Design a protein around this motif. Sequence first.
Motif, short mmCIF file in Angstrom:
data_model
loop_
_atom_site.label_atom_id
_atom_site.label_comp_id
_atom_site.label_asym_id
_atom_site.label_seq_id
_atom_site.Cartn_x
_atom_site.Cartn_y
_atom_site.Cartn_z
N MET A 97 0.80 -1.26 0.10
CA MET A 97 -0.04 0.01 -0.03
C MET A 97 0.87 1.28 -0.09
O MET A 97 1.81 1.29 0.80
CB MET A 97 -1.02 0.16 1.19
CG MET A 97 -1.84 -1.27 1.30
SD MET A 97 -2.99 -1.31 2.80
CE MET A 97 -1.77 -1.01 3.96
N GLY A 98 0.56 2.43 -1.04
CA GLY A 98 1.30 3.31 -1.01
C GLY A 98 1.93 3.56 -2.16
O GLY A 98 1.62 3.44 -3.41
N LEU A 99 3.40 4.15 -1.98
CA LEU A 99 4.04 4.59 -3.25
C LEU A 99 5.73 3.98 -3.17
O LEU A 99 6.14 3.86 -2.08
CB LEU A 99 4.33 6.20 -3.06
CG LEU A 99 3.01 7.17 -3.01
CD1 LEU A 99 3.58 8.72 -2.76
CD2 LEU A 99 2.30 6.65 -4.20
N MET A 100 5.98 3.19 -4.36
CA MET A 100 7.27 3.12 -4.51
C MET A 100 7.60 1.78 -3.58
O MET A 100 8.87 1.99 -3.14
CB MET A 100 8.16 4.06 -4.53
CG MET A 100 8.19 4.91 -5.75
SD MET A 100 9.17 6.34 -5.55
CE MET A 100 8.38 7.07 -4.07
N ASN A 101 6.61 0.79 -3.16
CA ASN A 101 7.11 -0.05 -2.31
C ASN A 101 7.48 -1.36 -3.50
O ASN A 101 6.98 -1.58 -4.28
CB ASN A 101 5.82 -0.51 -1.63
CG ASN A 101 5.52 0.33 -0.29
OD1 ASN A 101 6.26 1.20 0.11
ND2 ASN A 101 4.45 0.34 -0.16
N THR A 114 3.80 -10.93 3.37
CA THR A 114 4.54 -9.70 3.58
C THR A 114 3.62 -8.56 3.35
O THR A 114 2.71 -8.47 2.43
CB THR A 114 5.81 -9.51 2.44
OG1 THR A 114 6.39 -10.57 2.75
CG2 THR A 114 6.33 -8.09 2.80
N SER A 115 3.47 -7.56 4.39
CA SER A 115 2.71 -6.33 3.90
C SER A 115 3.40 -5.10 4.41
O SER A 115 4.10 -4.98 5.59
CB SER A 115 1.45 -6.31 5.31
OG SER A 115 0.63 -5.45 5.14
N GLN A 116 3.44 -4.36 3.27
CA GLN A 116 4.35 -3.05 3.13
C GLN A 116 3.40 -1.84 3.24
O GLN A 116 2.37 -1.85 2.37
CB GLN A 116 5.11 -2.83 1.98
CG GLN A 116 6.29 -3.88 2.06
CD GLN A 116 7.48 -4.06 0.74
OE1 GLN A 116 6.82 -3.94 -0.27
NE2 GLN A 116 8.71 -3.93 1.21
N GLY A 117 3.55 -1.20 4.11
CA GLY A 117 2.75 0.27 3.96
C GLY A 117 3.68 1.45 4.23
O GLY A 117 4.72 1.46 4.84
N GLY A 118 3.49 2.56 3.55
CA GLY A 118 4.36 3.63 3.46
C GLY A 118 5.00 3.93 2.12
O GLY A 118 4.51 3.40 1.03
N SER A 119 6.04 4.34 2.27
CA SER A 119 6.93 4.73 0.88
C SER A 119 7.98 4.21 0.93
O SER A 119 8.98 4.25 1.90
CB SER A 119 7.03 6.42 0.75
OG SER A 119 7.62 6.69 1.72
#
Lengths: 355, 355, 355
Positions: free
Chosen positions: C311-315, C330-335
Amino acid sequence: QGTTSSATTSQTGNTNTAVIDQVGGLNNSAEASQAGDGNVATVTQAEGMDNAVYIDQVGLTNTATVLQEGGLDNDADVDQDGDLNVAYIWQNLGEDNDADIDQDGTLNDAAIEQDGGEDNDADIDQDGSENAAYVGQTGGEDNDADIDQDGTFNNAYIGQFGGEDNEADLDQDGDANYAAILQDGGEDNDADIDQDGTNNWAETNQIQGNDNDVEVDQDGSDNIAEVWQMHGEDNEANVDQDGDLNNAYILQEGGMNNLADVHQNGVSNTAEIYQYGGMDNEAYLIQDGDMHTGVITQSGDGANYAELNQMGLMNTGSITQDGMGNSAITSQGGSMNMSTVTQSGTGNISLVNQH
Amino acid sequence: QGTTSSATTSQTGNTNTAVIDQVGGLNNSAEASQAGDGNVATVTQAEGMDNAVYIDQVGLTNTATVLQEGGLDNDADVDQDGDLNVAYIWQNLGEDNDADIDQDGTLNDAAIEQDGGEDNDADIDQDGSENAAYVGQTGGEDNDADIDQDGTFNNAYIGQFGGEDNEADLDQDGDANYAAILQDGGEDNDADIDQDGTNNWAETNQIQGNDNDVEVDQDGSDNIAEVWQMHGEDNEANVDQDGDLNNAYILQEGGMNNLADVHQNGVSNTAEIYQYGGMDNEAYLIQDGDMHTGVITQSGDGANYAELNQMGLMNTGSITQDGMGNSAITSQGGSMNMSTVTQSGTGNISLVNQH
Amino acid sequence: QGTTSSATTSQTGNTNTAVIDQVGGLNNSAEASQAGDGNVATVTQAEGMDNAVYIDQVGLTNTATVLQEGGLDNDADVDQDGDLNVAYIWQNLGEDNDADIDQDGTLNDAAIEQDGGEDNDADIDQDGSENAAYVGQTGGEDNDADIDQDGTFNNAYIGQFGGEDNEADLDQDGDANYAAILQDGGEDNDADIDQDGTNNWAETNQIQGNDNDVEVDQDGSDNIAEVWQMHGEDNEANVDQDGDLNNAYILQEGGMNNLADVHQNGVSNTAEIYQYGGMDNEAYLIQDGDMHTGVITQSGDGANYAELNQMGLMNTGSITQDGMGNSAITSQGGSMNMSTVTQSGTGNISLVNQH
């Protein structure tokens, strides 16, 4: 009461009868010559001027009757050679009308009738046994009728009611053939019938048409051809049948430069062509084989072309064109093929091939 | 040298001369009576038995001469009443011949000649001025000749050379008429001529025919009729002309029961009939009008019938029949009509009418 | 040489052209109807029995061509309504093959090719302007292909080379969308593509797989989806893209009951899934946001589970699993988050959370 009439009778043989009755008229000429036994000749000229009648009979029990009532410079000629031949000529109120009957054989019956008109020419020539021929011309100028029959039981009819320069030609060779030509009015109409074989039926009619041409040619047995052209100019109809039991019908009602052609070879082929008005419409129906059925219908102004060719057995074809410039070509090969084409409008092109 | 001859002369008047010379013969009787001035009578009987001559003249300068040379019971009688009448009778070697001349008028000349024969009777009766009559009978039995002339300048000739029971009768009334009858052989021939009018010419000849009958009747002026019948039995010829300048000629050579009839009324009509043998052939030629010309010719055995009737002016007609039973009837009415019919064979029937 | 062939042409309008050529075959039926101006119809049936062709064109300058060479009971139907539409149908040596083209609009191009096979069904339905569709079926039994295009400049390709009961469904709505489905062999393969929007690219390939299911759904602009399934049974691939410039790639080589799921929402998201054999392997790649990069790789037999959510930008995320039963989430939040997981062996459990 008539001045300078001349009548001559010359009879050689047994029990020949010649009667000449010239009542009134100036310079009428009648001649009757009979060589043989039992020949009967009757000439009756009434109120005509410069009318000429000549009868020449050779053989047994030949009968000739000529009746000219009035008219100027009417010429009638009868020539019978054989037995039991019957000839009748009638000319009423016509100027410069020429009638000729020539019968050679047995039991031949010929009749020529000319009611009025100027320069009308009628000719009948029969050779054989029991042939019947009739020529009728009511009114008109420069009308020409010719019948030529050779064989047995042949029936020929030619009728011309009015019109100028109408030409009718009939030729029959064989047994039991029937041919009929009718021309009611119109200028420069040409009709030609030629039949060879047995029991062939041909009929042509031209009603109030100018420059119409009809040609019928039948070879074989039991062929039926019917052609009608009504109120059309420069219309051409051609029928050619070879074989047995072939039926052809052509109808052209109005129009200019319309061409219909029927060609049939085989047994029991049926062809029908209908054209209702229009210019330069062309219809061709060819059937080579047995039991073919073809129908062509055209209605429209301008260069409608229809062609229906059927080869083999029991092929069925129908073409209908309505409008301008429609072109349809159907070709059926094999057995039991069925084709139906319907075109409406301008510039329609249809090609059907059923092998 | 002759026994019981008797001659008597009785003359009253001035300068009458009577001479009777009976040379030979038994019981000849001659009587000459002349009352008047200048009458001359001569009788000469030579070698005849029971011959009787009687001359009776009344008037001025009448001349009668009778010469009977031989014969038994010949009777001659001359009776002249008038002036300048001349009568001559000659009887040579005839038995029971009777000659009678009766002239009343002026300048009449009559001559009777009988050379042989038995029971021949000749009679001449002239009334008028300058009439000439001659009767000649050479041979034959029971021949009868009679001439009756009334008028001026009439010429009559009758000749009978042989034959039994031949009868000739001539009657002329008018001016300048010539009639001649000739019968050379044959039994029961009857000839009759009757002329009334001026300058009529009639001649009839019967040569070696039995039961032939000829009758000519002319009324008018300048009519000419000639009839010839040669070697035929029961042939009848009849000519009837009324008018001026009519010419009729009939010839019948052989045949039995052939009938020819010519009837003409008008001016300058010409008719000719010729029959050559045949039985029951009948020809009739009738011309009513002026300048008609008609010719009929028949040759054949059995019931040939020809009739040609022409009415009007300058109609010309010719009919010729050869064979058996041919029947032709032509009737022309009007002016300048020409008809020619020729039939040969058996049973031909022709009817021509030119109105 | 063929019996009972039937051909019908019906043209209304101006300058319409219809050509039907049936060479050989028993009871072939062809019908061409053209209403409008300039329509062109061509039908060619060769050596086929009981083949049926129907073309119906309405409008201006529509072009339709049908060629059926051989086969039993082949049916072809073309229906064009509009202007400048082009339709082509080819059927070679197939039995009971059904082809249907329905074009409504302008400048639409549709092509159907069926080379052999039994009971193959192809359907193309285009509505709009300048849409291009192609369906090809070479061999196989009971193969079903369906294309439905609505809009402008849409390109659709369906190919089926062999196999039984293979189903391909393509649906495009919008502008300039490209979709391609390929099925080379295999039984009961199901491919479905649905594109809504502009300039979307979708490609699906199934090679020699049985019971494989592929579903692609794209909404938006410039989305690219590629799916490959080779030699696998019961493999399921699902792609769902919403937005712009999203790229999804799925590869499944062999294996049974392998499941791949890609879900992308946003702009410029990249997802790649690779599965090499194995049973019950499950891969899920979810990217909500912009410029995400995700890679999942699975190699091993049995219940490998991988989940990558960004979720977000450029992960950036990478998951690699080798062996049996490995589970990685794997769960990515942020930039600008970067995650790398590598598991080898049996029963490995990995949980990565990068908030």
